[PDB]
Amino acid sequence: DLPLDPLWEFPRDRLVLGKPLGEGCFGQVVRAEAFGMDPARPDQASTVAVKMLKDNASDKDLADLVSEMEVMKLIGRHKNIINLLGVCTQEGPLYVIVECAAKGNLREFLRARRPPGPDLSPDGPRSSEGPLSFPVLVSCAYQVARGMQYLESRKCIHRDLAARNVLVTEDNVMKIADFGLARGVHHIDYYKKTSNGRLPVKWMAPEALFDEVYTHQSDVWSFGILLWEIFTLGGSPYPGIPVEELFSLLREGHRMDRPPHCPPELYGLMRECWHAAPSQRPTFKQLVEALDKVLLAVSE
Numbered sequence: 001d002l003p004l005d006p007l008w009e010f011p012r013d014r015l016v017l018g019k020p021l022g023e024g025c026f027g028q029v030v031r032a033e034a035f036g037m038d039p040a041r042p043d044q045a046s047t048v049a050v051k052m053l054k055d056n057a058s059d060k061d062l063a064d065l066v067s068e069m070e071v072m073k074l075i076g077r078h079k080n081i082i083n084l085l086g087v088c089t090q091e092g093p094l095y096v097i098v099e100c101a102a103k104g105n106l107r108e109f110l111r112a113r114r115p116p117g118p119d120l121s122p123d124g125p126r127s128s129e130g131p132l133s134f135p136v137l138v139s140c141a142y143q144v145a146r147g148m149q150y151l152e153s154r155k156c157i158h159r160d161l162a163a164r165n166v167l168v169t170e171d172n173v174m175k176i177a178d179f180g181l182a183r184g185v186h187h188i189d190y191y192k193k194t195s196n197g198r199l200p201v202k203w204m205a206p207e208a209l210f211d212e213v214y215t216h217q218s219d220v221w222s223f224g225i226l227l228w229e230i231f232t233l234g235g236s237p238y239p240g241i242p243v244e245e246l247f248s249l250l251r252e253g254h255r256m257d258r259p260p261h262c263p264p265e266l267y268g269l270m271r272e273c274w275h276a277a278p279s280q281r282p283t284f285k286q287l288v289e290a291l292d293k294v295l296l297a298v299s300e
């Protein structure tokens with residue numbers, strides 16, 4: 001139906017579709033095996049993630065997926081984003097084939113790796129030692145910032161940057177996902193709670209929430225919320241605060257408390273990201289450098 005772009009088109013018979021990975025506002029994502037994604041190695045298998053529509057898709061749904069496809073084509077390659085690998089547009093359903101992130105999203109990655117509580121019986125030399133260490137947490141924040149810096153340099157605004165939209169590869173590389181999305185910003189249900197209990201309004205910069213204004217600086221606000229997620233090891237922001245109360249607390253200039261076991265350097269960066277004036281928040285370039293300073297100081 002769509003025109004053939006030989007740069008990106010991949011034969012669909014070289015895909016074997018596997019288990020669904022999740023469902024979005026438009027489309028679903030399925031795990032898949034690809035053969036010959038590298039044309040030099042035509043019979044080589046690789047694991048990829050395939051974006052496609054749901055069975056109840058509207059023409060808007062298709063338009064949104066096509067739009068996402070065209071954004072991916074233009075963004076280019078970066079270590080810290082989910083990269084476009086190919087598309088299937090001819091003689092069958094629309095597939096947008098992207099990198100697969102074997103460990104799933106960063107929020108569940110952190111929550112699954114919280115340290116053992118004090119109820120655990122000591123068993124061997126490391127029973128106190130959880131999987132997550134401070135330098136790895138800082139490297140996670142640093143990588144997200146570098147990925148966001150790259151997206152900004154390509155004039156891409158994410159608009160729902162959150163731990164759940166960052167994915168983790170088999171080597172613990174952070175990759176920003178779903179950056180190219182039509183997000184219906186003129187009809188957000190602010191009271192919307194997801195199937196997993198998320199209130200996405202808790203990531204929106206004030207100018208986005210109150211004035212429907214998005215810039216790279218409003219993504220910086222969301223980044224500070226994501227820093228808070230990281231250093232609470234996957235915690236939900238504004239603990240215990242329902243949306244009605246979020247609205248007035250934000251109007252009053254309320255910010256989240258410094259969370260436990262979080263050095264003042266990192267809470268300082270959080271509070272900078274949540275300065276009222278978007279021009280008084282750091283840029284992603286400044287965040288990359290600041291986090292790099294910490295990461296180097298603690299990676300002896």
Ligand SMILES: *C(=O)c1nc2c(C(=O)Nc3cc(NCCOC)c(C#N)cn3)cn(CCN3CCOCC3)c2cc1Br
Nearest residue numbers: 021022029049082098099100101102103104105164165177
């Ligand atoms: C393939 O590398 C792979 N992916 C797995 C995921 C996963 O979520 N991958 C994923 C998801 C998306 N997008 C949906 C979420 O969007 C924010 C994209 C994109 N774009 C790319 N990749 C999850 N698993 C399950 C594995 N873990 C480890 C075992 O315990 C917890 C579950 C994936 C497995 C693979 Br092989």
